[PDB]
Amino acid sequence: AVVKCKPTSPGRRHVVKVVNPELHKGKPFAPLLEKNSKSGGRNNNGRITTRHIGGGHKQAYRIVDFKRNKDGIPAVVERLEYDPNRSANIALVLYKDGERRYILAPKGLKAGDQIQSGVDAAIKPGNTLPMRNIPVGSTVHNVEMKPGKGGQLARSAGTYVQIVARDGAYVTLRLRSGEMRKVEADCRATLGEVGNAEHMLRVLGKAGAARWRGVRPTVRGTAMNPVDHPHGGGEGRNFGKHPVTPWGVQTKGKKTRSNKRTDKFIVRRRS
RNA sequence: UAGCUAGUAGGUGGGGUAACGGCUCACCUAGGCGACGAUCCCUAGCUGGUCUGAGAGGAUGACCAGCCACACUGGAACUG
RNA sequence: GGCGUAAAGCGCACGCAGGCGGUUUGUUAAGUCAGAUGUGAAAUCCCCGGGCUCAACCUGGGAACUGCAUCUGAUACUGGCAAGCUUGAGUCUCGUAGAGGGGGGUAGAAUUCCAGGUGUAGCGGUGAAAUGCGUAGAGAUCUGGAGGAAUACCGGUGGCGAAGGCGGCCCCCUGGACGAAGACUGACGCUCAGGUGCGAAAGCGUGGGGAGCAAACAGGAUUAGAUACCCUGGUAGUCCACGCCGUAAACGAUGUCGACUUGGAGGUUGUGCCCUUGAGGCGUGGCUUCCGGAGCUAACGCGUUAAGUCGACCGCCUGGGGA
RNA sequence: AAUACGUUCCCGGGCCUUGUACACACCGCCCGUCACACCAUGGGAGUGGGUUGCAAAAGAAGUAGGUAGCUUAACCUUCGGGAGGGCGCUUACCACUUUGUGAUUCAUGACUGGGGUGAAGUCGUAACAAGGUAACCGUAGGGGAACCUGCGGUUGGAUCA
RNA sequence: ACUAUGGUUUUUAUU
RNA sequence: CGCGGGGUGGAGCAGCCUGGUAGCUCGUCGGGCUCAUAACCCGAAGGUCGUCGGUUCAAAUCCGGCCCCCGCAACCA
RNA sequence: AGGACCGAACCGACUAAUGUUGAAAAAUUAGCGGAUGACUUGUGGCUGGGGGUGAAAGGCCAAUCAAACCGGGAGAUAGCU
RNA sequence: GCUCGCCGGAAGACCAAGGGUUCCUGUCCAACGUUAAUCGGGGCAGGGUGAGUCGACCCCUAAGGCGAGGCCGAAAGGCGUAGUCGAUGGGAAACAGGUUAAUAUUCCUGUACUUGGUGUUACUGCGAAGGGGGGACGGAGAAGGCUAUGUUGGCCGGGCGACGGUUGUCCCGGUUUAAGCGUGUAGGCUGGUUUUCCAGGCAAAUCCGGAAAAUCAAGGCUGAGGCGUGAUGACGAGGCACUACGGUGCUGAAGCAACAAAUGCCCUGCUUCCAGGAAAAGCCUCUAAGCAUCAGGUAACAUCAAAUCGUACCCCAAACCGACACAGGUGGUCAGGUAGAGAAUACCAAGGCGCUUGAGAGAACUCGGGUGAAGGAACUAGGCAAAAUGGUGCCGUAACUUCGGGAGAAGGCACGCUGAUAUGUAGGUGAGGUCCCUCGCGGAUGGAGCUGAAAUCAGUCGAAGAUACCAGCUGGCUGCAACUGUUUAUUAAAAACACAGCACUGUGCAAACACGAAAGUGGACGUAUACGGUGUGACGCCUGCCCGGUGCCGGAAGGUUAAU
RNA sequence: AAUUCCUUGUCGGGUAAGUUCCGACCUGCACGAAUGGCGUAAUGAUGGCCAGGCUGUCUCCACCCGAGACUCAGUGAAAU
RNA sequence: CUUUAAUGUUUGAUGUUCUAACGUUGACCCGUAAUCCGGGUUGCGGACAGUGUCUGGUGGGUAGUUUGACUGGGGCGGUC
């Protein structure tokens, strides 16, 4: 759900939040908690490597088991929880052996319902049944771009991803990025969907409300002195150049992809 | 014309009057009215009747019959 | 007095007060009418006198002033309060066709993109021609894959629906209509100011999406010019999760209910029958196309699904320019 | 002298039917901007009375209750004064008179939208015939005017739709 | 294909 | 400031630079198409080539004067 | 509840006055601007010169900056005073 | 010394740091002191600083550093594992009577108490560096309890009147006693028990975690403060004695009730919202290791140590910091009446101070306050300055608005003292009578006494009841600007920058991008509703053309063309 | 117009009189649609403009009063 | 001498495939019941990344340098 604030007292007028009563809010399961230390937007080489960073209110990290080490174990989803670290929210998995792990919160938000692991598992949602066993046309989430490498590709909020085609010992899926991509089909994925999908409807409303979120204000390149950014202030309304980043890259149209290692996995782009 | 009261809405004991009344001083409560047109401004006294027409309807009240209001303009008491 | 079209039913469904309401035995007697007691003065309108030049007028008598106030009577009928009655109405027994509604599943032509081959100056189009795509391989042709709108033909003497409308294939859920012999309440009904509900489109709003087509704008032509048609492109929009609006030729110009009447050609759907020598026929309801008799309208025509006939309820009309 | 298959299609005519927003009859009819002298209304920086709501200024006389001090008509009286009024004071209610912000109406105004009339002009030629791009309705984007281009609806259209 | 335009006013009714 | 152009039968500009030499599209009048004017196709008349001179065999051009115009422009005590 | 209004602590400077051989190479008064916040503050750490840090001023980097502070090259160089 | 006066959240007072004898005693005046100077936060010589418990060390750790082996970098230098350090964070024991010129949670005197070691007897599995539990930590909001405290009463000690009066109108002095223990109370928290058990707790587990069978209730926890107790001692006004009284003891009164009360204590509580909020160790407990009439454990009893650092004096201050005996600054901390919500503003308590040349003078004038006739913004670049306004509730309140605001709009009315109803009522609090039980930091009923709102009526008073201080001037036209933020330390305080919002675009993850000799980092423990960047500036109207230049995206035939 | 050279453009309104202020022009030698153009409220230590309240700002300045000026005694400078 | 099958085959590319090179930004084994990454085995990629010599292009990121003399002060035009 999504809510706007009432314009009572100055500054509240434009503030829009995402809200959900079907999802729990509180403290995390302590054996999967760490404080996760800040870099400050600086590295071990003594210079700034990031921008728009600093300060903010107190926050910890909820440890999600993206890279898995075993299969076959029966489980139940014990909790469905909010997570400040990710737009996708979090769910607590309780395995029959007395073991707990975190996963991304499934679209159904349902607690106390069983899920099975391994190639013996039923063709049912949320089971740890790898793509070699699944029908084409199924929805997967957190699709595991390369097998054994764990949860990456299509794992942020509102994602589902559908398996479109088969190509021998591989399967091909379609992305909202205009890309259609082939994967080695031993990939596990989450055999389902992820929730939220409302996070782009938020409106920050205030000029200070990013500050408590660890964000710092950043000056326009043509407003600072010519010694720090290739733009550089004038002279009123000067520019007289092609627009660039603080490091000389043309801000529009100019491309920067240079990988050239894995082109055979990418079937279509800008589709 | 979509707002209107507030002695208004419903009770209590004296005082005032020929006499009803929140007439009038106290005290006991918080409503009452209205689109099914409350209420307020603009204009205007009203009527026996007169004028019109086949009548309905419309217009109109001087002059001849009958009330009200008003007395430089505003305001206070007496007399009865 | 009018509301199909001159002037008007206010785009379409539900519905409280308001207003309306079958048939019968009681009962109240407000309304009504009856009867009586008061009133409608003086004038005045009308008829006939008196008196002042005629007459007016001022006066005398009649006749009027069809009205109004009350107290009794009657209760046909409206209101009101009891009580029946089964016909209106609603409920029920049984089911069908179709684009009626809702949620999901799904596919192809053409096109474009993805990935490639066969092959060479054309493509595409006009009265005639460019631009553009095009030799760097455009068009043609074909293999594999995928997207999206709209769902070709059927398709119209057709269905379903309150209007707008709604079609494509399958499944689940689901609204409303219609009839015969009986059952049930026993006037429970009709309409309805306000009230509560519903877009073909275009637009806007929050967020997506871009094949097809295309306002705007560019390129080239035609031409006086061409702000148009032609033609190479193309945004918004169309599509979707939806929201707001209430928009129109929402025009098949018929507000909603009730009832009587004259024929035919034709189709469908119930329901009941047939001495069914039929490859079917006939009653009787609902829908329903097109001619046609009466009657209404200036005229077209309406024509039993009325613009004939006639009760109940709610809105609208009274020159145009200007609005 | 020659040419004539044969009337497909122009010019100019006739009859017939369908349209007609035509009728000195297509040399018909017809739209609006611009030029310009006017008239009324709307909008309006403003200029200003009329009038009034609410909250408030105000305290003359009057009425109601108090009422020192000083006094004195009628009653009482020991003839000294006593009683109540007077006077002079007081607590209420209080005629005028004085503002603050609202509301509303009539006057009035630079400049001005749209509308009707006069100047028959300038501009193109938008609707009526199949009206030279079928028309129209809603609604966006454009547009010197008149319009034009799209999506859906509908014929107040039309060529064997 | 393309080929536009034409002010206002200006007739018949017998006794 | 200083710089660079234009002045061409009536209008507005090609021409010039490259010397063997006066024009185009309109305009004016008269035709052709027509009932007629436009659109359109033809016919006809007229250049101090701003204008005074210079120079040469020879021009509007080479080139000085006397005027008329525009563009950049006043960016220094 | 509060990137609201009052306001002491704290933070900060709109005006007038004082001070710049002044108590002081930024302190003072009287009216103050803010004051649960994009706040402010105690403490430590990390970032360094053609580099840092900056809601980014040739500002800040210990009185210092169109390259600070210290030393070396250095007894720089000066058609001139 | 007495008196007068000023400050009184400070001009009172407690304490670290950091400074460095400033604390004590003497004599030196030469120098010092913005003046004498006999004095000393001066010069100089000597005196004084005691710890099981304090605060620190040990233990543990953040940010971060240090870093063998290992790695990058001509090099300087950097990275980083095993490990190791480290505060502004977490952990064992402390309070205060005695007092000397100067010393004391340290000695003296009491009481409290923790950690490490040695060892016997009896019985006996103990135990990590690992695992679990806990430690444990967002910011506000709102009741209750409580106490040093407040203010009277009583009591003991004293006063009773030169003065208007002071034996029912009294006044002053005093009325005190820790940490901690025991009881286990306000306030606050809340399911256990008995049994078996799987691939988890990257090894082990009897403890967690999870699965099943069984079974029980009304108990399980935390504890401010009271009381006892620490303490028949201490403290105590008053009384008394003796050797050089040259100090140093002896003695000793009252020692209590009422109500209100914190910022402190219950409390990091509870409640509440949100941006979702350190870890480890001690401690409890499970097991791994290792070992055995050892060590450990359980019970009884003896017993050795508490080492390591600091301690005087200062303290918002002429002992710190500002070169100064400096218009100033400096880390922690407390806070009563009377009015008021007062770390507002006024006067004062407790308490301190009269501000480091002094004395004449008393002139226009200057620095700065107070008052002003009549007129008023006429002045001035500028109502600039000055002056006025200034509180609460009720009555009342427009244009414009993003419908929240504008608005405490504007304009005005009220605002003392006494009496009364209830001469003090409602809430809170509080002693009996009555009533009940295991019992007791006892409950039920009850409400004399204490504290005391809220409202109305009746009298009385001045010029004036927000009486003083402190505390908005008001409205209207326009531009600009969203509102809150940021700034050129000393000429700009803003319309700039930031910023909600927006377009265009790059980025498929070993992302793009950034640091940079190059690794390893940062992006991100993020993965296309995720991240990068530019500019414009929230919200509403919206937002056209030119592809010639130059760049970018894309394209490959033809031509120029290097190494070779 | 925070843009207009020449411009007090020219004009209405605001004053007795207005280079500014308020509302226009369409003549922008030269604004202009994210180097964004168009626009409004609370509001800002924001420029201008109109009025009242209060006022020694101004008219004409007056009186009152600390601390300094003056004179001592101590200590006792300096730029020049 | 044409063009070429089958057999033999040098070579730079294009395009697949294979894999010992190389990688792991996977797993496993052990260091280590180590938050470095060393070795080993496997899975999956795969002849490349990366880097040095030659070389074309571009290259303010970075360096070094100048803009003559006269102009009756400086300048526009003029002058050498």
mmCIF file with all atom_site columns, N, CA and C (backbone and C1' of nucleotides) in Angstrom, chain A residues 39 61 87 98 149 155-156 176 179 181 255-257, chain H residues 209 508-510 512 515 522 526-530 554:
data_model
loop_
_atom_site.group_PDB
_atom_site.id
_atom_site.type_symbol
_atom_site.label_atom_id
_atom_site.label_alt_id
_atom_site.label_comp_id
_atom_site.label_asym_id
_atom_site.label_entity_id
_atom_site.label_seq_id
_atom_site.pdbx_PDB_ins_code
_atom_site.Cartn_x
_atom_site.Cartn_y
_atom_site.Cartn_z
_atom_site.occupancy
_atom_site.B_iso_or_equiv
_atom_site.pdbx_formal_charge
_atom_site.auth_seq_id
_atom_site.auth_comp_id
_atom_site.auth_asym_id
_atom_site.auth_atom_id
_atom_site.pdbx_PDB_model_num
ATOM 1   N N     . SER A 1 39  ? 32.184 2.192   4.567   1.00 0.00 ? 39  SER A N     1
ATOM 2   C CA    . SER A 1 39  ? 33.405 2.594   3.878   1.00 0.00 ? 39  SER A CA    1
ATOM 3   C C     . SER A 1 39  ? 33.619 4.107   3.926   1.00 0.00 ? 39  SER A C     1
ATOM 4   N N     . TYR A 1 61  ? 22.597 -4.879  9.371   1.00 0.00 ? 61  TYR A N     1
ATOM 5   C CA    . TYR A 1 61  ? 22.404 -5.725  8.191   1.00 0.00 ? 61  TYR A CA    1
ATOM 6   C C     . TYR A 1 61  ? 21.820 -7.100  8.546   1.00 0.00 ? 61  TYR A C     1
ATOM 7   N N     . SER A 1 87  ? 14.788 -3.148  -0.848  1.00 0.00 ? 87  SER A N     1
ATOM 8   C CA    . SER A 1 87  ? 13.440 -2.871  -1.288  1.00 0.00 ? 87  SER A CA    1
ATOM 9   C C     . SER A 1 87  ? 12.540 -4.110  -1.388  1.00 0.00 ? 87  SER A C     1
ATOM 10  N N     . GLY A 1 98  ? 16.406 -27.864 12.752  1.00 0.00 ? 98  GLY A N     1
ATOM 11  C CA    . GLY A 1 98  ? 16.514 -26.788 13.750  1.00 0.00 ? 98  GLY A CA    1
ATOM 12  C C     . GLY A 1 98  ? 17.381 -25.614 13.273  1.00 0.00 ? 98  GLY A C     1
ATOM 13  N N     . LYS A 1 149 ? 26.677 -19.998 -8.260  1.00 0.00 ? 149 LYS A N     1
ATOM 14  C CA    . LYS A 1 149 ? 27.040 -18.616 -7.893  1.00 0.00 ? 149 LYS A CA    1
ATOM 15  C C     . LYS A 1 149 ? 25.973 -17.919 -7.061  1.00 0.00 ? 149 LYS A C     1
ATOM 16  N N     . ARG A 1 155 ? 16.385 -9.860  -8.783  1.00 0.00 ? 155 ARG A N     1
ATOM 17  C CA    . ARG A 1 155 ? 16.140 -10.075 -7.345  1.00 0.00 ? 155 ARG A CA    1
ATOM 18  C C     . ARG A 1 155 ? 15.636 -8.852  -6.588  1.00 0.00 ? 155 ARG A C     1
ATOM 19  N N     . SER A 1 156 ? 15.639 -7.664  -7.190  1.00 0.00 ? 156 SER A N     1
ATOM 20  C CA    . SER A 1 156 ? 15.038 -6.474  -6.597  1.00 0.00 ? 156 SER A CA    1
ATOM 21  C C     . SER A 1 156 ? 13.529 -6.529  -6.686  1.00 0.00 ? 156 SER A C     1
ATOM 22  N N     . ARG A 1 176 ? 13.207 -6.917  -18.171 1.00 0.00 ? 176 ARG A N     1
ATOM 23  C CA    . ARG A 1 176 ? 12.638 -5.579  -18.319 1.00 0.00 ? 176 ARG A CA    1
ATOM 24  C C     . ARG A 1 176 ? 13.642 -4.535  -18.826 1.00 0.00 ? 176 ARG A C     1
ATOM 25  N N     . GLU A 1 179 ? 16.691 -6.993  -22.392 1.00 0.00 ? 179 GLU A N     1
ATOM 26  C CA    . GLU A 1 179 ? 17.636 -8.050  -22.626 1.00 0.00 ? 179 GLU A CA    1
ATOM 27  C C     . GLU A 1 179 ? 16.975 -9.439  -22.576 1.00 0.00 ? 179 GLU A C     1
ATOM 28  N N     . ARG A 1 181 ? 18.328 -13.371 -22.223 1.00 0.00 ? 181 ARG A N     1
ATOM 29  C CA    . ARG A 1 181 ? 19.546 -13.983 -21.759 1.00 0.00 ? 181 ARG A CA    1
ATOM 30  C C     . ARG A 1 181 ? 19.395 -15.476 -21.513 1.00 0.00 ? 181 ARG A C     1
ATOM 31  N N     . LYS A 1 255 ? 28.509 5.396   -24.967 1.00 0.00 ? 255 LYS A N     1
ATOM 32  C CA    . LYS A 1 255 ? 28.500 4.049   -24.359 1.00 0.00 ? 255 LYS A CA    1
ATOM 33  C C     . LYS A 1 255 ? 29.784 3.717   -23.640 1.00 0.00 ? 255 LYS A C     1
ATOM 34  N N     . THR A 1 256 ? 29.729 2.784   -22.685 1.00 0.00 ? 256 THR A N     1
ATOM 35  C CA    . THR A 1 256 ? 30.857 2.433   -21.828 1.00 0.00 ? 256 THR A CA    1
ATOM 36  C C     . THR A 1 256 ? 31.044 0.939   -21.541 1.00 0.00 ? 256 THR A C     1
ATOM 37  N N     . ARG A 1 257 ? 30.136 0.049   -21.954 1.00 0.00 ? 257 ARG A N     1
ATOM 38  C CA    . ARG A 1 257 ? 30.283 -1.413  -21.929 1.00 0.00 ? 257 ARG A CA    1
ATOM 39  C C     . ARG A 1 257 ? 31.523 -1.827  -22.704 1.00 0.00 ? 257 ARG A C     1
ATOM 40  P P     . G   H 2 209 ? 15.829 -22.104 22.573  1.00 0.00 ? 209 G   H P     1
ATOM 41  O "O5'" . G   H 2 209 ? 16.043 -22.655 21.102  1.00 0.00 ? 209 G   H "O5'" 1
ATOM 42  C "C5'" . G   H 2 209 ? 16.424 -21.790 20.039  1.00 0.00 ? 209 G   H "C5'" 1
ATOM 43  C "C4'" . G   H 2 209 ? 16.617 -22.580 18.744  1.00 0.00 ? 209 G   H "C4'" 1
ATOM 44  C "C3'" . G   H 2 209 ? 15.447 -23.471 18.358  1.00 0.00 ? 209 G   H "C3'" 1
ATOM 45  O "O3'" . G   H 2 209 ? 14.357 -22.753 17.864  1.00 0.00 ? 209 G   H "O3'" 1
ATOM 46  C "C1'" . G   H 2 209 ? 17.420 -24.625 18.062  1.00 0.00 ? 209 G   H "C1'" 1
ATOM 47  P P     . G   H 2 508 ? 26.079 -3.633  -18.988 1.00 0.00 ? 508 G   H P     1
ATOM 48  O "O5'" . G   H 2 508 ? 25.393 -4.314  -17.712 1.00 0.00 ? 508 G   H "O5'" 1
ATOM 49  C "C5'" . G   H 2 508 ? 26.088 -5.150  -16.818 1.00 0.00 ? 508 G   H "C5'" 1
ATOM 50  C "C4'" . G   H 2 508 ? 25.642 -6.616  -16.944 1.00 0.00 ? 508 G   H "C4'" 1
ATOM 51  C "C3'" . G   H 2 508 ? 25.685 -7.234  -18.350 1.00 0.00 ? 508 G   H "C3'" 1
ATOM 52  O "O3'" . G   H 2 508 ? 25.982 -8.625  -18.287 1.00 0.00 ? 508 G   H "O3'" 1
ATOM 53  C "C1'" . G   H 2 508 ? 23.537 -7.361  -17.484 1.00 0.00 ? 508 G   H "C1'" 1
ATOM 54  P P     . C   H 2 509 ? 27.449 -9.146  -18.277 1.00 0.00 ? 509 C   H P     1
ATOM 55  O "O5'" . C   H 2 509 ? 27.972 -8.766  -16.831 1.00 0.00 ? 509 C   H "O5'" 1
ATOM 56  C "C5'" . C   H 2 509 ? 27.468 -9.469  -15.704 1.00 0.00 ? 509 C   H "C5'" 1
ATOM 57  C "C4'" . C   H 2 509 ? 28.064 -8.903  -14.419 1.00 0.00 ? 509 C   H "C4'" 1
ATOM 58  C "C3'" . C   H 2 509 ? 27.816 -9.855  -13.245 1.00 0.00 ? 509 C   H "C3'" 1
ATOM 59  O "O3'" . C   H 2 509 ? 29.039 -10.050 -12.624 1.00 0.00 ? 509 C   H "O3'" 1
ATOM 60  C "C1'" . C   H 2 509 ? 27.198 -7.649  -12.694 1.00 0.00 ? 509 C   H "C1'" 1
ATOM 61  P P     . A   H 2 510 ? 29.435 -11.501 -12.194 1.00 0.00 ? 510 A   H P     1
ATOM 62  O "O5'" . A   H 2 510 ? 30.873 -11.259 -11.620 1.00 0.00 ? 510 A   H "O5'" 1
ATOM 63  C "C5'" . A   H 2 510 ? 31.124 -10.455 -10.475 1.00 0.00 ? 510 A   H "C5'" 1
ATOM 64  C "C4'" . A   H 2 510 ? 32.298 -9.496  -10.716 1.00 0.00 ? 510 A   H "C4'" 1
ATOM 65  C "C3'" . A   H 2 510 ? 32.085 -8.542  -11.893 1.00 0.00 ? 510 A   H "C3'" 1
ATOM 66  O "O3'" . A   H 2 510 ? 32.736 -7.285  -11.686 1.00 0.00 ? 510 A   H "O3'" 1
ATOM 67  C "C1'" . A   H 2 510 ? 33.817 -10.060 -12.361 1.00 0.00 ? 510 A   H "C1'" 1
ATOM 68  P P     . A   H 2 512 ? 32.374 -3.094  -15.937 1.00 0.00 ? 512 A   H P     1
ATOM 69  O "O5'" . A   H 2 512 ? 31.894 -1.591  -16.099 1.00 0.00 ? 512 A   H "O5'" 1
ATOM 70  C "C5'" . A   H 2 512 ? 31.253 -1.191  -17.300 1.00 0.00 ? 512 A   H "C5'" 1
ATOM 71  C "C4'" . A   H 2 512 ? 30.487 0.104   -17.109 1.00 0.00 ? 512 A   H "C4'" 1
ATOM 72  C "C3'" . A   H 2 512 ? 31.278 1.330   -16.662 1.00 0.00 ? 512 A   H "C3'" 1
ATOM 73  O "O3'" . A   H 2 512 ? 31.971 1.966   -17.724 1.00 0.00 ? 512 A   H "O3'" 1
ATOM 74  C "C1'" . A   H 2 512 ? 29.228 1.149   -15.484 1.00 0.00 ? 512 A   H "C1'" 1
ATOM 75  P P     . C   H 2 515 ? 39.773 8.539   -10.475 1.00 0.00 ? 515 C   H P     1
ATOM 76  O "O5'" . C   H 2 515 ? 40.285 7.815   -9.187  1.00 0.00 ? 515 C   H "O5'" 1
ATOM 77  C "C5'" . C   H 2 515 ? 40.339 8.501   -7.943  1.00 0.00 ? 515 C   H "C5'" 1
ATOM 78  C "C4'" . C   H 2 515 ? 41.113 7.702   -6.935  1.00 0.00 ? 515 C   H "C4'" 1
ATOM 79  C "C3'" . C   H 2 515 ? 42.517 7.428   -7.400  1.00 0.00 ? 515 C   H "C3'" 1
ATOM 80  O "O3'" . C   H 2 515 ? 43.373 8.539   -7.170  1.00 0.00 ? 515 C   H "O3'" 1
ATOM 81  C "C1'" . C   H 2 515 ? 41.478 5.513   -6.371  1.00 0.00 ? 515 C   H "C1'" 1
ATOM 82  P P     . G   H 2 522 ? 35.732 -2.575  0.372   1.00 0.00 ? 522 G   H P     1
ATOM 83  O "O5'" . G   H 2 522 ? 35.320 -1.247  -0.369  1.00 0.00 ? 522 G   H "O5'" 1
ATOM 84  C "C5'" . G   H 2 522 ? 35.278 -0.001  0.305   1.00 0.00 ? 522 G   H "C5'" 1
ATOM 85  C "C4'" . G   H 2 522 ? 34.910 1.117   -0.659  1.00 0.00 ? 522 G   H "C4'" 1
ATOM 86  C "C3'" . G   H 2 522 ? 33.570 0.966   -1.343  1.00 0.00 ? 522 G   H "C3'" 1
ATOM 87  O "O3'" . G   H 2 522 ? 32.444 1.263   -0.556  1.00 0.00 ? 522 G   H "O3'" 1
ATOM 88  C "C1'" . G   H 2 522 ? 35.198 1.645   -2.868  1.00 0.00 ? 522 G   H "C1'" 1
ATOM 89  P P     . G   H 2 526 ? 23.233 -7.554  -0.430  1.00 0.00 ? 526 G   H P     1
ATOM 90  O "O5'" . G   H 2 526 ? 22.409 -6.665  -1.431  1.00 0.00 ? 526 G   H "O5'" 1
ATOM 91  C "C5'" . G   H 2 526 ? 21.705 -5.535  -0.990  1.00 0.00 ? 526 G   H "C5'" 1
ATOM 92  C "C4'" . G   H 2 526 ? 21.895 -4.380  -1.975  1.00 0.00 ? 526 G   H "C4'" 1
ATOM 93  C "C3'" . G   H 2 526 ? 21.494 -4.685  -3.418  1.00 0.00 ? 526 G   H "C3'" 1
ATOM 94  O "O3'" . G   H 2 526 ? 20.128 -4.601  -3.686  1.00 0.00 ? 526 G   H "O3'" 1
ATOM 95  C "C1'" . G   H 2 526 ? 23.589 -3.699  -3.401  1.00 0.00 ? 526 G   H "C1'" 1
ATOM 96  P P     . U   H 2 527 ? 19.396 -5.806  -4.411  1.00 0.00 ? 527 U   H P     1
ATOM 97  O "O5'" . U   H 2 527 ? 20.089 -5.902  -5.832  1.00 0.00 ? 527 U   H "O5'" 1
ATOM 98  C "C5'" . U   H 2 527 ? 20.133 -4.810  -6.731  1.00 0.00 ? 527 U   H "C5'" 1
ATOM 99  C "C4'" . U   H 2 527 ? 20.582 -5.262  -8.109  1.00 0.00 ? 527 U   H "C4'" 1
ATOM 100 C "C3'" . U   H 2 527 ? 19.739 -6.430  -8.626  1.00 0.00 ? 527 U   H "C3'" 1
ATOM 101 O "O3'" . U   H 2 527 ? 19.387 -6.129  -9.955  1.00 0.00 ? 527 U   H "O3'" 1
ATOM 102 C "C1'" . U   H 2 527 ? 21.993 -6.857  -8.854  1.00 0.00 ? 527 U   H "C1'" 1
ATOM 103 P P     . A   H 2 528 ? 18.207 -6.881  -10.657 1.00 0.00 ? 528 A   H P     1
ATOM 104 O "O5'" . A   H 2 528 ? 17.528 -5.717  -11.457 1.00 0.00 ? 528 A   H "O5'" 1
ATOM 105 C "C5'" . A   H 2 528 ? 16.796 -4.751  -10.736 1.00 0.00 ? 528 A   H "C5'" 1
ATOM 106 C "C4'" . A   H 2 528 ? 16.359 -3.601  -11.640 1.00 0.00 ? 528 A   H "C4'" 1
ATOM 107 C "C3'" . A   H 2 528 ? 15.555 -4.062  -12.846 1.00 0.00 ? 528 A   H "C3'" 1
ATOM 108 O "O3'" . A   H 2 528 ? 14.626 -3.078  -13.196 1.00 0.00 ? 528 A   H "O3'" 1
ATOM 109 C "C1'" . A   H 2 528 ? 17.641 -3.072  -13.525 1.00 0.00 ? 528 A   H "C1'" 1
ATOM 110 P P     . U   H 2 529 ? 13.213 -2.965  -12.523 1.00 0.00 ? 529 U   H P     1
ATOM 111 O "O5'" . U   H 2 529 ? 13.394 -2.186  -11.153 1.00 0.00 ? 529 U   H "O5'" 1
ATOM 112 C "C5'" . U   H 2 529 ? 13.897 -0.858  -11.114 1.00 0.00 ? 529 U   H "C5'" 1
ATOM 113 C "C4'" . U   H 2 529 ? 13.427 -0.131  -9.857  1.00 0.00 ? 529 U   H "C4'" 1
ATOM 114 C "C3'" . U   H 2 529 ? 13.637 -0.893  -8.550  1.00 0.00 ? 529 U   H "C3'" 1
ATOM 115 O "O3'" . U   H 2 529 ? 14.063 0.083   -7.611  1.00 0.00 ? 529 U   H "O3'" 1
ATOM 116 C "C1'" . U   H 2 529 ? 11.368 -0.421  -8.891  1.00 0.00 ? 529 U   H "C1'" 1
ATOM 117 P P     . A   H 2 530 ? 14.851 -0.291  -6.314  1.00 0.00 ? 530 A   H P     1
ATOM 118 O "O5'" . A   H 2 530 ? 16.267 -0.756  -6.777  1.00 0.00 ? 530 A   H "O5'" 1
ATOM 119 C "C5'" . A   H 2 530 ? 17.081 -1.467  -5.878  1.00 0.00 ? 530 A   H "C5'" 1
ATOM 120 C "C4'" . A   H 2 530 ? 18.503 -1.529  -6.394  1.00 0.00 ? 530 A   H "C4'" 1
ATOM 121 C "C3'" . A   H 2 530 ? 19.230 -0.185  -6.515  1.00 0.00 ? 530 A   H "C3'" 1
ATOM 122 O "O3'" . A   H 2 530 ? 19.630 0.380   -5.277  1.00 0.00 ? 530 A   H "O3'" 1
ATOM 123 C "C1'" . A   H 2 530 ? 19.655 -1.529  -8.396  1.00 0.00 ? 530 A   H "C1'" 1
ATOM 124 P P     . G   H 2 554 ? 27.129 2.445   -30.929 1.00 0.00 ? 554 G   H P     1
ATOM 125 O "O5'" . G   H 2 554 ? 26.718 2.472   -32.465 1.00 0.00 ? 554 G   H "O5'" 1
ATOM 126 C "C5'" . G   H 2 554 ? 25.531 1.818   -32.875 1.00 0.00 ? 554 G   H "C5'" 1
ATOM 127 C "C4'" . G   H 2 554 ? 25.240 2.083   -34.351 1.00 0.00 ? 554 G   H "C4'" 1
ATOM 128 C "C3'" . G   H 2 554 ? 26.235 1.523   -35.346 1.00 0.00 ? 554 G   H "C3'" 1
ATOM 129 O "O3'" . G   H 2 554 ? 26.161 0.114   -35.494 1.00 0.00 ? 554 G   H "O3'" 1
ATOM 130 C "C1'" . G   H 2 554 ? 25.441 3.642   -36.028 1.00 0.00 ? 554 G   H "C1'" 1
#
